[PDB]
Design a protein around this ligand. Structure first.
Ligand code: CA
Ligand code: CA
Ligand code: CA
Length: 126
């Protein structure tokens, strides 16, 4: 098997978000890779939130396991929550910092994709 890596996504924070009409944003993130979904907790009333989450996607395929997707949401009453923006990146081996510009503000995070032993290259194919 080729294209395998250990993917870890962390250092989540966002700036100048706009999620409510009368108060500050109540943001949370949904992060997706290879059929797995992780959701952070909510940071109430803060347009510049930071989260302590470290998401370990275990052994994944950087070649074909779809993009790494980060959705920025604002918490309201659940079913009526606001989707503030979404970002897609095709992860590559090594350490990488990501900045996704949204309609208002931006979301930032880092990821480290380490090829599994015997594998090398941008997508661990070699
Ligand atoms: Ca809202
Ligand atoms: Ca609010
Ligand atoms: Ca809200």
């Amino acid at each position: 098997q080729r294209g395998l890596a250990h993917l870890v996504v962390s250092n989540f924070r966002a700036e100048h978000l706009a999620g409510d009409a009368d108060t500050a944003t109540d943001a949370y993130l949904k992060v997706f890779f290879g059929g797995q979904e992780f959701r952070t907790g909510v940071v109430w009333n803060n347009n510049n939130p930071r989260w302590t989450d470290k998401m370990d996607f275990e052994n994944v395929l950087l070649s074909t396991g779809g993009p790494l997707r980060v959705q920025v949401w604002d918490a309201d009453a659940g079913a009526d929550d606001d989707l503030l923006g979404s970002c897609d990146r095709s992860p590559h081996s090594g350490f990488h910092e990501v900045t996704c510009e949204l309609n208002h503000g931006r979301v930032k995070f880092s990821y480290h994709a380490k090829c599994l032993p015997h594998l090398t290259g941008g997508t661990c194919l070699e």
